[PDB]
Ligand binder design. Structure first.
Ligand SMILES: CC(=O)C1=CN([C@@H]2O[C@H](COP(=O)(O)OP(=O)(O)OC[C@H]3O[C@@H](n4cnc5c(N)ncnc54)[C@H](O)[C@@H]3O)[C@@H](O)[C@H]2O)C=CC1
Ligand SMILES: CC(=O)C1=CN([C@@H]2O[C@H](COP(=O)(O)OP(=O)(O)OC[C@H]3O[C@@H](n4cnc5c(N)ncnc54)[C@H](O)[C@@H]3O)[C@@H](O)[C@H]2O)C=CC1
Ligand SMILES: Cc1cc2c(cc1C)N(C[C@H](O)[C@H](O)[C@H](O)COP(=O)(O)O)c1[nH]c(=O)[nH]c(=O)c1N2
Ligand SMILES: Cc1cc2c(cc1C)N(C[C@H](O)[C@H](O)[C@H](O)COP(=O)(O)O)c1[nH]c(=O)[nH]c(=O)c1N2
Ligand code: SF4
Ligand code: SF4
Ligand code: FES
Ligand code: FES
Ligand code: NA
Ligand code: NA
Ligand code: NA
Ligand code: NA
Ligand code: NA
Ligand code: NA
Ligand code: NA
Ligand code: NA
Ligand code: NA
Lengths: 155, 417, 417, 156
């Protein structure tokens, strides 16, 4: 396995950004996940070499940090907050609306690999509960009609 | 410059300081910041000795806005008694439930934070500073990267800043999903490219932090005060609010209020005033049952008249106000808090590791009506025994709020028994 | 809390403009957002202004203020002229029998606001106005509050939703003059002056507020704009007949069982408005006449006309004042004469003296104190209000009365003896 | 000399700062003045002109033009009665009669206590609810004298 040159260039920028290469590990893993829609297991050995770190170190880090997903490829990650404020204000309504539109529940991917619902802890937008993200974009859920229109923006 | 979508959190200020620009929900760039007199505090700072800046921040009575309320000036003094090099870290990991005060500064007025980081760094003799921002704030990350470049272009960062001989680079690091990486020592481990495992304290970071060197870690909101202290002087700063607990404070208010949002208020304000005077009262004008101070404390409706200060009888914490009303099931709410700690213990310490897990696992059974008598007794036991041998604050408090609900709402718990 | 407003009945077969406004209460931004509100604006901001103009043109939307000028074409005229440009929402609604616009304002203000924002973007206006008549104080307070809600949610201000588009909406109040709904008098009033219409051409789109390109559009017109963008112009054009497409509001009053505002397609006939929708006549008396505000008088032989902007159609505002067999047409004509007497601005001599004399002499006729000369004088004056007039008031101050003279000669004759 | 009380002056300054140009606030200011005093005091016009940076005769002409403003009669509550076509058809005269029975005044007149003035106005844009009146900013359908009496009892 080998990184495409456009991605490798991007990883090199991160590695060169901080004073020490190993500081770039999380920026690198975000970049990888952005590129592939998940963390390819085969990507870690080459990344470890670029960071001048042992492979097991890199594996331990991927395992520790909940945002990284080595299991499921998805184009769009719908992160749904399931913490206290969103729960009080209507996480379950958002989840039901998502099941109506997409036919999936938290932890599942659509068969086309387009959407995965990820249950997450407080997203720091609790005044706008219930909160969800679609990749980097963040939104307040208002209603199913509203949600349907938002999701239609992601092709 | 296109940024990811951010919901437009309502913000309101009686003081017009931290939210002078951030009360408007958009990015304020360097030109607008400069038009409002920004970066003149930095210029003034660079004409001062580091020693004097520390003195002013000390005399301002500024206390840590990350939640513990440690005196900021004292923290800095401790760092500078130790040989360099030294590092300055802005903690932007903000992941406590209910807490969204720091992001509005980052996303709407980044230069206020940047200006604060430069002054603070100069004060402690750090030439290398960091912002560690949680991974779930991607817009904040790009906004900060862009603002740093703006600051560089105007000569507020780099070598020999404004001819002072002071050098600074600010690096922006991203988290990747761990609440624990907001704990200052786990944050440092993460900056060093490792898992977010807290270290035994002492030593405190000011003695031994990043690469073992003296390191000051301060919260976004703490740092955002620094430009005001320099701009107005410490005397004028103390005239804001009560003289013991001076300065503006941000209060993220959520849950069952009419106007959820961030409020900039003085800390003599009461909790009752926050909910009713500022946040518009309760949804449906229902009675307040409880306020959760993030995931730390639970206040009952008999405790609304307390001041929002760092006094022993005060609200304290981060200023986070999650309002529950008369219909909200306290056991259901306690389960959500239990689930949070279950998901975020790093697992280094055995009672924290097993305790956070079992607290959540048993409370779910209780909630679902499937708990045996031994499950009930076990729940009580585990809740009281998460803390022993813990080396950070998560283990120390993972049972705290839940215990308070057990003591303050016995009627509702007994109904589940 | 807002001033008391009568609860005008509203009914829709289309569920568009009256989807919320069929319920007689203020719908605030959260309710609007729940129904998908402001998503059309988000869509619009991802389109070019030129595209938006194209869609509004192809929709067939015509001016709902009464003249039926094609809206997209009006916008195109504006944008061929150099900026800055201004956008004005005309909420002066003061035509007798006309209360269609106020129910949008007072019940679903965000529909109007969303429309204003999209329209302003389309024509490159960064400053927009609502001019609301002084006798709608509640509408004014409701709009001011709604605009602040829109600001809170980032739909107004600078750099709206990262688009780079800036907009402020200012709410001005009238103070008693019907003529200030004439678009040029409205502009004079916005400039701080008496409501004196300007010689046209130039039209506002060439020379308007502060002499700059200005679009004036009616409340109802603007309320259509979110639908055109949301549905697309083709789907919008499926509503009603393809040559006069879209929802229309019909304010129905007088001797009907169910007076109120009806949202209906424009292929609806006048007879259907009265009998199918408005419940027929009070006491099931025969229809004698329908006044289209103060503009036209239709007889009972003219009820099978379409409620569209065709030459043989009802046209106007869609205002339907029903008179039945026992209502004295000369008494009714007097009230129309009194209206125009009260509202001429007096700049033009035949309008000034003609509106006055028409009313003065018709009162004498009505009271049986008219000489033969007064009769002949009334006829002459009625035919001679229009010459030299620079606005539509003088053009039509004799129109409805003349139509009653032609359509109800027997009633008038009874007065001439 | 005449000066605006600070509470009023403050409100006038908000209006004047609201629009991009000061002169655009003229009607909002005059509404505010009439709200405060129960009419437009002639003496108020010169200070307002100064605040708007307009000549006095400009302000005077604007007050004269706009029918809502009243320089003659102080009244705490203005009962605006619609006298246009629909309300006329549906019972304006019944409403006027009821008002005379309760208050003892006709259109154009003020009660002896200065509490109520009846103002005849053109179509108020609530014609489906004819006959229509306003009491200051509040607006109502007239149903009957007993009902009107109850409505008016709320204005003290
Ligand atoms: C904002 C947010 O998302 C969260 C905030 N928190 C807050 O974190 C707080 C606990 O933090 P910590 O365990 O760091 O508190 P502490 O009291 O041990 O120390 C606070 C600060 O003072 C310094 N400090 C304390 N004693 C010191 C000493 N003797 N010498 C030097 N520095 C000292 C210490 O290094 C830290 O920066 C709680 O009150 C929570 O409110 C927790 C989780 C998430
Ligand atoms: C709703 C309400 O209370 C009232 C409504 N009206 C209505 O006002 C209408 C007359 O309005 P106006 O004199 O403005 O009509 P118009 O046909 O001269 O112009 C209509 C619109 O098209 C524009 N327009 C017309 N010709 C144009 C041209 N050559 N170029 C550019 N714009 C043009 C013009 O600027 C205006 O906005 C009548 O049909 C009434 O029904 C009158 C009084 C009160
Ligand atoms: C589990 C856990 C999590 C966090 C913290 C603590 C613990 C125990 N702390 C507090 C942090 O360790 C430290 O006290 C502050 O960052 C110090 O800065 P101030 O003195 O508040 O300016 C913390 N602080 C902060 O600024 N942001 C955060 O996200 C967190 N998160
Ligand atoms: C005397 C008089 C009074 C008014 C008008 C005309 C005349 C002659 N017009 C029509 C106005 O000048 C203009 O045509 C419309 O406002 C344009 O908007 P639309 O093209 O209908 O959307 C008008 N229009 C409106 O929207 N509201 C109003 O109250 C009035 N009043
Ligand atoms: S107390 Fe808990 S969270 Fe803190 S270091 Fe120990 S196991 Fe980790
Ligand atoms: S036609 Fe009549 S209302 Fe119009 S400008 Fe002339 S005088 Fe004034
Ligand atoms: S609890 Fe969901 S964003 Fe905070
Ligand atoms: S005629 Fe009286 S409100 Fe219209
Ligand atoms: Na270094
Ligand atoms: Na979950
Ligand atoms: Na300023
Ligand atoms: Na520069
Ligand atoms: Na209404
Ligand atoms: Na605005
Ligand atoms: Na009038
Ligand atoms: Na301007
Ligand atoms: Na009215």
């Amino acid at each position: 396995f080998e990184f495409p040159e456009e991605l490798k260039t991007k990883l090199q920028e991160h590695i060169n950004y901080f004073p020490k290469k190993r500081q770039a590990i999380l920026l690198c893993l975000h970049e990888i996940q952005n590129y592939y829609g998940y963390i390819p297991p085969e990507s870690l050995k080459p990344l470890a070499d670029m960071l001048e770190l042992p492979l097991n170190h890199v594996e331990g880090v991927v395992a520790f940090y909940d945002m990284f997903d080595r299991e499921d490829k998805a184009k769009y990650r719908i992160r749904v907050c399931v913490s206290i404020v969103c729960h009080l204000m209507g996480t379950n309504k958002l989840l039901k609306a998502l099941e109506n539109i997409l036919g999936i529940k938290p932890g599942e991917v659509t068969p086309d690999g387009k959407f995965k619902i990820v249950p997450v802890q407080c997203l720091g937008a609790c005044s706008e509960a219930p909160v969800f993200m679609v990749n980097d974009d963040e939104y307040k859920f208002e209603s199913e009609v509203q949600l349907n229109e938002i999701l239609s923006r992601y092709t | 410059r296109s940024y990811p979508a951010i919901p437009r959190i309502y913000a309101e200020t009686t003081l017009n300081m931290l939210l002078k620009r951030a009360k408007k929900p958009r990015v304020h760039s360097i030109d607008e910041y400069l038009k409002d007199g920004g970066y003149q505090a930095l210029e003034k700072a660079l004409n001062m000795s580091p020693e004097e800046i520390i003195d002013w921040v000390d005399k301002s009575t500024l206390r840590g806005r990350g939640g513990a309320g440690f005196p900021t000036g004292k923290k800095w003094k401790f760092a500078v008694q130790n040989p360099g090099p030294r590092y300055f870290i802005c903690n932007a990991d903000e992941s406590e439930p209910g807490t969204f005060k720091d992001r509005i500064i980052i996303e709407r007025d980044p230069h206020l934070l940047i200006e604060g980081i430069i002054i603070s760094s100069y004060a402690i003799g750090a030439n290398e500073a960091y912002i560690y921002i949680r991974g779930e704030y991607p817009a904040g990350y790009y906004i900060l990267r862009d603002a740093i470049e703006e600051a560089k272009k105007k000569g507020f960062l780099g070598k020999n800043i404004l001819g002072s001989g002071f050098d600074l680079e600010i690096y922006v690091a991203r988290g990747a999903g761990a609440y624990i990486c907001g704990e200052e020592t786990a944050l440092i481990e993460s900056l060093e490219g490792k898992r977010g495992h807290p270290r035994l304290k002492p030593p405190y970071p000011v003695q031994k932090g990043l690469w073992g060197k003296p390191t000051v870690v301060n919260n976004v909101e703490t740092i955002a005060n620094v430009p005001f202290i320099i701009s107005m002087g410490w005397e004028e700063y103390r005239y804001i609010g009560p003289s013991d607990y001076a300065g503006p404070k941000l209060f993220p208010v959520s849950g069952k209020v009419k106007k959820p949002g961030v409020y900039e208020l003085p800390m003599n304000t009461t909790l009752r005033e926050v909910i009713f005077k500022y946040a518009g009262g309760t949804l449906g004008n229902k009675k307040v049952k409880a306020v959760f101070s993030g995931a730390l404390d639970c206040f009952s409706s008999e405790e609304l008249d307390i001041p929002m200060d760092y006094s022993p009888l005060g609200f304290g914490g981060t200023g986070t106000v999650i309002v529950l009303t008369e219909e909200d099931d306290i056991v259901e709410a306690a389960l959500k808090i239990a689930e949070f700690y279950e998901h975020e213990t790093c697992g280094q310490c055995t009672p924290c590791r097993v305790g956070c897990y079992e607290q959540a696992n048993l409370l779910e059974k209780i909630y679902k009506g499937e708990a045996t008598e031994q499950d009930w007794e076990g729940f009580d036991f585990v809740n009281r025994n998460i803390q022993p041998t813990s080396i950070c604050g998560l283990g120390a408090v993972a049972g705290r709020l839940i215990r308070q609900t057990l003591e303050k709402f016995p009627e509702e718990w007994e109904k589940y028994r």
